[PDB]
Amino acid sequence: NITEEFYQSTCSAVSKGYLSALRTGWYTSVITIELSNIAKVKLIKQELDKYKNAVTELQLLMQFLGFLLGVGSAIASGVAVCKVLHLEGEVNKIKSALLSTNKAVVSLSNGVSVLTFKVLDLKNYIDKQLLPIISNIETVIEFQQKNNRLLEITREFSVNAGVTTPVSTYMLTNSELLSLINDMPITNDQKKLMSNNVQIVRQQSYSIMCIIKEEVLAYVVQLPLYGVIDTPCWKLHTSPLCTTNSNICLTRTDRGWYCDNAGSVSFFPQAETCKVQSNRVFCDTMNSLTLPSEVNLCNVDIFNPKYDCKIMTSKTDVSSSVITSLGAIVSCYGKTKCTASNKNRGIIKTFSNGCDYVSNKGVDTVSVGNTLYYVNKQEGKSLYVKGEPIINFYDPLVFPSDEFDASISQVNEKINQSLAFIRKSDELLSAI
Amino acid sequence: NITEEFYQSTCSAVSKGYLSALRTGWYTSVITIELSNIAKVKLIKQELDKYKNAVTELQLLMQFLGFLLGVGSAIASGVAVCKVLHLEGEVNKIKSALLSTNKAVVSLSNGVSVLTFKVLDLKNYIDKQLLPIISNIETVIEFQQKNNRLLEITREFSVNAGVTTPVSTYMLTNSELLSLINDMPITNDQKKLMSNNVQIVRQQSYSIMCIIKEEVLAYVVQLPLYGVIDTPCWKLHTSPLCTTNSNICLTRTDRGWYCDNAGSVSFFPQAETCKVQSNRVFCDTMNSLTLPSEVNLCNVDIFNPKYDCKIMTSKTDVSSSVITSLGAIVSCYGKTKCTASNKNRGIIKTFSNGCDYVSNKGVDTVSVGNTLYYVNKQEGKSLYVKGEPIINFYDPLVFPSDEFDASISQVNEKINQSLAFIRKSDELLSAI
Amino acid sequence: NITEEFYQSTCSAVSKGYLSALRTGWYTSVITIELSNIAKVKLIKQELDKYKNAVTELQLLMQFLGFLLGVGSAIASGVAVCKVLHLEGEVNKIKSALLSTNKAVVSLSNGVSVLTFKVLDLKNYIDKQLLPIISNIETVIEFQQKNNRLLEITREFSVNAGVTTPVSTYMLTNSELLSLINDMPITNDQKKLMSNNVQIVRQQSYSIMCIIKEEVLAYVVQLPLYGVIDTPCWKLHTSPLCTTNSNICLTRTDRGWYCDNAGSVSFFPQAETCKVQSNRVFCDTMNSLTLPSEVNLCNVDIFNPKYDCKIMTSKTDVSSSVITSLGAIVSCYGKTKCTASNKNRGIIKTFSNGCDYVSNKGVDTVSVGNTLYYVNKQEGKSLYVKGEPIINFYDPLVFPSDEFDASISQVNEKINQSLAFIRKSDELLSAI
Numbered sequence A, B, C: 001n002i003t004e005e006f007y008q009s010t011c012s013a014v015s016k017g018y019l020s021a022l023r024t025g026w027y028t029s030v031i032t033i034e035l036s037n038i039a040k041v042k043l044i045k046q047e048l049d050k051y052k053n054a055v056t057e058l059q060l061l062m063q064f065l066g067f068l069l070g071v072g073s074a075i076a077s078g079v080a081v082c083k084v085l086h087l088e089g090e091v092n093k094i095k096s097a098l099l100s101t102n103k104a105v106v107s108l109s110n111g112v113s114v115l116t117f118k119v120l121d122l123k124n125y126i127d128k129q130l131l132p133i134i135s136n137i138e139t140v141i142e143f144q145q146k147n148n149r150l151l152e153i154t155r156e157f158s159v160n161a162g163v164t165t166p167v168s169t170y171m172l173t174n175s176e177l178l179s180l181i182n183d184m185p186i187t188n189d190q191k192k193l194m195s196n197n198v199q200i201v202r203q204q205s206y207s208i209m210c211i212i213k214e215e216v217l218a219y220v221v222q223l224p225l226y227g228v229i230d231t232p233c234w235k236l237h238t239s240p241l242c243t244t245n246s247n248i249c250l251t252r253t254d255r256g257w258y259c260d261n262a263g264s265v266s267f268f269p270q271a272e273t274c275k276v277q278s279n280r281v282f283c284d285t286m287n288s289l290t291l292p293s294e295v296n297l298c299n300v301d302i303f304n305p306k307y308d309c310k311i312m313t314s315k316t317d318v319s320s321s322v323i324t325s326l327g328a329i330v331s332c333y334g335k336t337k338c339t340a341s342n343k344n345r346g347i348i349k350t351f352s353n354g355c356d357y358v359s360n361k362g363v364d365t366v367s368v369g370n371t372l373y374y375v376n377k378q379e380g381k382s383l384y385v386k387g388e389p390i391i392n393f394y395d396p397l398v399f400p401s402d403e404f405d406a407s408i409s410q411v412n413e414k415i416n417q418s419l420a421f422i423r424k425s426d427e428l429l430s431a432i
């Protein structure tokens, strides 16, 4: 059940009812391809040239508040595992564990247990079916089918400098991926979540070309660990709130995704980086701040004493809309034409200057100036929370503008400083 | 005829002579693939496994001033149509309309008329040519050709979580796209514009994986509607204007594309998002503000009383160049070596400190510091508009710096406030 | 030998020991494909339809401190060469030079010498092997192999509007690319660098669809020229430094890559755009400022008199980490849990409020709040440079905040201005 509340007082809206699936860690697996080290004859010859060129190719290869975020190194974990694979005997240990089976767990020298997977055995095909020789066109066609995956994996690594994301189905098919997922050291809830959202897993994964040695091509596939699942998440949408006379504006800068997480709240300022499937919200904690849960008080009382709500101030009263989960915030200023239109695309509401809102219940589109917006048609209940625009409480003569990284308290203190000087001068001039 | 004017007074240039093609709306079409629900034998078997895996795969899938812009939901319209397709009988209505023909218009339950297109009939091939059985290698090769498009469409949807852009030729071939365009509910000028710029259409379109049901795979292709065409557009290029003594700077922040539109001007602050083909400018109104046409006065008189021109101020006098449509603005400060070189790449001009400009008439490259820039070699006429740099009119002792979201009037008022305090203190101290 | 120093006084770290490979220019080559202008029969027929559709398809196609950077036109050089190819006889001059050989140097009319390369001769295959006619399935399979490259090149150009980057192996194979590199007008050190980093070359190159005329399809491949190689580079990492009481913060804004270059320093503020292979740093001077070499003094003495070090100020004391080349800077404020954990992922250090640092020697991960970071496991020597946090030297009562584009001197002058007013008022009030 998605619900939404629009706060007329602060030109913002919160969409609730979502459930988290946060990427909190990384699981590293090792994917191997076993290789053979070596008219119809002419066709099979150039197909073998493609095989040989691909192998040497990989060998040559082997040789508003976003600014507050930290800086990670997203493939540090997989690169660390890849460095381990270059150590003496480490590849032979994997090649021995996969002689009899195609999937096995190996303990690496650095104290990390990895799943290994042999997804293609070109050694078996070339040595036992091709090295004897053609007579049959079926054999050249068959070789083209077995070789094609290696050729495409090589093409992908070649234009991506050895590191791909999302992980393609050439890197890992869906059968292989679902198989990997079922044996990961993770909870049953995690396996079910990953299996039902395999395309999101692919988008959050990396494939890291690693080593080609002892007739084994190995790459690391770095898959997300979802260590936070099924906690409540909510999306905060914000738009500029201006006077409508010489006008002053403020905007809540804390727009983004929020998810309850381990007694705090994970805040993702770039909402567009999260992926939303139905009511499940996939975000990456690398893109988050960890905030006190009192940050949510900014939605019910922006002047609350427990948390200093973030805002920016300006005098740039331009018109726009923010399309929410269940409706549309409209910031309409100056001479702009701002309307909402219904299922027959007849205008049913004309917005006055100010910040206002409509739900997707009877509205299909909103137009602000020359920009038409389609609203999301997701089912849910929207509530309009009436309130006097807080911009009305500010004296424009002492209003601090061009504040980007500001807050309620910061702005109040500047106002207090400005008023103190005026009161001091009026009394110092009257005494003189 | 492209022309350009450089304004020495404000370190900016306007390139004119372009014609608009603005994406203002969305047209939703439904693309269907009819499916069969079920040595040479071994080759045909695994090709059928690919077909079957692809089908279940899709079923698993089905289960400076940019900060002033609003926030849209770009696939709201297509997703809305896709939700309609999941309603009872809605797929059977499309499957019946396409039994006899491959393209037909269907009226959807939500009151929207859509073009539907059957681009591949795998049902017909598998049921009537493959289900009887091999003898012929031509039949296994033929099946590989018919199956390949489904396999590639599936691969594309798999790494893009069911939503692709640009729309590939696997999603829609050029014949199919040109066919679709010719029957859209659009003017003949729109059809001609789309047909002659099919690669831009592809880049502005979305493919949305929708439903697989009743032996029909359906995706929505969301194509741009160009509701503004052939109006004048112009590109504004801006660069920092600093004193050249302790130095102060300002930069016009309103750089971007401007197009006349419906009595106002659509302003696109991120010029790099628009696509330019010859003199035709493809921008998306989702990425625009709607401004009074008096915004253009900032190019002829930045102090004009009708529109408050936007600027940022600073003390960071670093050197750079802005390559324009027909030349190069050069902001050369401090000790930087700044030059322009001719067709033989001999230096023909050395820039002095300040903001200056050369046209592409005799210049192939400009170098600022260690950065070499190639200038665009588009034919056109450039005009150098002489004028005293406006930064010379500001007293640095009362110049407000670190103003990002500022304007001519805002800066003037801060200057006035600063001067008022100085005049008051000088008179209050003299009386004491 | 990579080394790193952490400056406790300024919450920053410098990673040293890297060597430059800067893209400073562009080399333009012309790549041509010679074309034929014209059950097994049914298979060969539709393969010829693909060939014909691809040809007409291309003919239709032919018809913190980043804000301080300038604006280039990255394909101006290649587009300039392409315009030359449309001039009368210019294509015939290339077609004659490639009749006997597949690679030749041609002097263009604009005074530029280009390497030309015939990578595929479909004219020879269609006219001499296909036009006589099928009997043999080998001939239809052979045609599918020769045609496939043209079909894929066309697909790539179609979804990229005629301009691709990185340059794929369909555009230029690795043999072709390595061949091109060996004959470029460049030093032997450049050839070796390009040949050993072909995947980086591909990522910095453009393919520009140019002309299809006189049975010749031609595209320009624009390859990087690395005119600065083997000079020292260093990476500056910075994180917010706040008091830990009402708190004030500053952050060094000059984070990014720095490379010695021609007596100055090339500064790349968006470090993520550079590519790092082992200790070689590939950056693009289009993404750089050219700075005095005294900018490096900010790392040893941020108050130095020779260069005015850049900082931003604020009151937003939120916690985060910056993962460096050899360790991790941790900015831990408020109630945040901040820890570092060892090879067995046991916590071995808990950070106090403030800015601190660990090396990758005994640490595998750092956690700040709900965000776990893996550190890079690159071998190297880290040095912790102790020093009193410079934020401790500022009186918070006169500290200017919300300064984004600021510097040490700018902040000092604002402080001086604020203190002057307070001292003047205290003396003017005491006299009254």
Ligand SMILES: CS(=O)(=O)N1CC2(C1)C(=O)N(Cc1nc3cc(Cl)ccc3n1CCCC(F)(F)F)c1ccccc12
Pocket: A067, A404, A405, B064, B065, B067, B402, B404, C064, C066, C067, C312, C313, C314, C401, C402, C403, C404, C405
């Ligand atoms: C052209 S741009 O798109 O490159 N852009 C960078 C740009 C313009 C911007 O937005 N500001 C507004 C701003 N003032 C700030 C004050 C603090 Cl204390 C903190 C953050 C702040 N910001 C947001 C910047 C954050 C980042 F750029 F990193 F995203 C800003 C101010 C002065 C100079 C240039 C700019």
